[PDB]
Amino acid sequence: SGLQGHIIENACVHHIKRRDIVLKWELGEGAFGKVFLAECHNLLPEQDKMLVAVKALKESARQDFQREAELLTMLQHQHIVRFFGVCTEGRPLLMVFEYMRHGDLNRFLRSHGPDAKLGGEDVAPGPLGLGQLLAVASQVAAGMVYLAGLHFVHRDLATRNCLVGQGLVVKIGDFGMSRDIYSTDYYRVGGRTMLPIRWMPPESILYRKFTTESDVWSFGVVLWEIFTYGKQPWYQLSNTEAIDCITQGRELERPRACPPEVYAIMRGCWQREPQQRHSIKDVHARLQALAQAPPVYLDVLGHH
Numbered sequence: 001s002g003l004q005g006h007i008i009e010n011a012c013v014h015h016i017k018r019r020d021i022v023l024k025w026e027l028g029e030g031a032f033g034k035v036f037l038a039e040c041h042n043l044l045p046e047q048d049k050m051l052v053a054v055k056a057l058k059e060s061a062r063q064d065f066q067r068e069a070e071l072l073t074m075l076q077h078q079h080i081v082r083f084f085g086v087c088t089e090g091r092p093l094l095m096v097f098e099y100m101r102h103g104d105l106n107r108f109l110r111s112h113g114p115d116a117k118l119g120g121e122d123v124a125p126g127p128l129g130l131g132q133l134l135a136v137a138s139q140v141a142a143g144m145v146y147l148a149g150l151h152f153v154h155r156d157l158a159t160r161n162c163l164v165g166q167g168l169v170v171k172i173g174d175f176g177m178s179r180d181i182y183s184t185d186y187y188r189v190g191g192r193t194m195l196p197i198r199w200m201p202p203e204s205i206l207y208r209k210f211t212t213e214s215d216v217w218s219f220g221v222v223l224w225e226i227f228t229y230g231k232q233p234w235y236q237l238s239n240t241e242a243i244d245c246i247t248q249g250r251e252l253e254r255p256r257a258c259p260p261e262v263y264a265i266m267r268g269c270w271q272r273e274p275q276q277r278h279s280i281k282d283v284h285a286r287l288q289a290l291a292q293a294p295p296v297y298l299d300v301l302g303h304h
């Protein structure tokens with residue numbers, strides 16, 4: 001449950017008046033609640049009014065909301081979805097986040113991939129270029145560095161759990177609806193429990209262990225998703241065949257658009273032994289340089 005997992009190991013929360021939040025329309029809905037585009041007044045200076053994404057809590061779940069909001073208030077970084085605070089006067093209780101114009105990273109990758117149907121404000125016509133793909137991956141890594149820095153275990157790192165804003169700014173974050181919107185990205189064990197198996201290392205599938213290291217493995221899989229324009233990992237396999245391949249040491253193939261150097265960052269996250277796995281700091285440091293490298297050096301990395 002991500003935020004919940006960090007709470008089960010271990011207020012500065014900003015409050016917003018209901019009259020300062022004006023609900024416009026729904027963006028999505030699930031089981032834990034729904035998301036609305038809203039207009040927020042007197043939130044930030046030199047703006048007066050601004051657009052935000054509002055999570056409306058759908059029982060003794062009100063206490064959960066408060067600790068989640070406390071955790072979200074602490075979790076502030078350039079590549080973590082900005083949390084503005086809560087509205088606790090009257091029901092439904094709301095969490096207020098920034099509005100991310102391009103939506104989740106998976107949706108954005110596929111819409112700028114070779115399988116997209118078809119204007120070009122933040123990015124060029126046709127599929128994303130190498131430079132665009134690298135900057136994307138680096139921001140996700142930066143965000144994961146801040147999380148390993150604060151010693152936070154995500155448990156569900158995937159491009160569907162990242163968001164894209166104006167000027168191609170990518171941040172880790174979701175509104176708790178991935179299980180409803182991307183149900184095929186989870187394996188239903190029984191009753192309620194749904195696991196993102198295609199993104200999980202052998203110790204999370206086999207031993208049910210979740211760490212900072214199972215999170216670097218997921219990043220490796222996120223790196224693969226970036227270079228395949230949001231394709232589902234092990235798409236050719238059923239849930240049981242995918243569990244089998246992961247537990248039997250199989251590695252995901254090198255994507256077409258992926259340079260051997262980027263594939264080496266991936267393979268480093270995919271070491272069977274959690275200890276052997278490369279730290280997120282170095283995975284990020286390796287990606288920052290690859291992203292901020294001259295086009296002369298970049299063009300020699302991408303062939304054909």
Ligand SMILES: Cc1ccc(NC(=O)c2ccc(C(F)(F)F)cc2F)c(-c2ccc(F)cc2)n1
Pocket residue numbers: 001002003004032055068072075080081095147153154155156172173174175176177
């Ligand atoms: C059922 C479910 C599953 C997963 C969720 N996401 C998280 O726990 C999560 C969100 C954000 C970040 C980061 F890094 F951006 F700070 C890290 C995370 F692990 C949620 C969720 C619950 C409350 C909420 F305000 C937002 C999302 N709910």
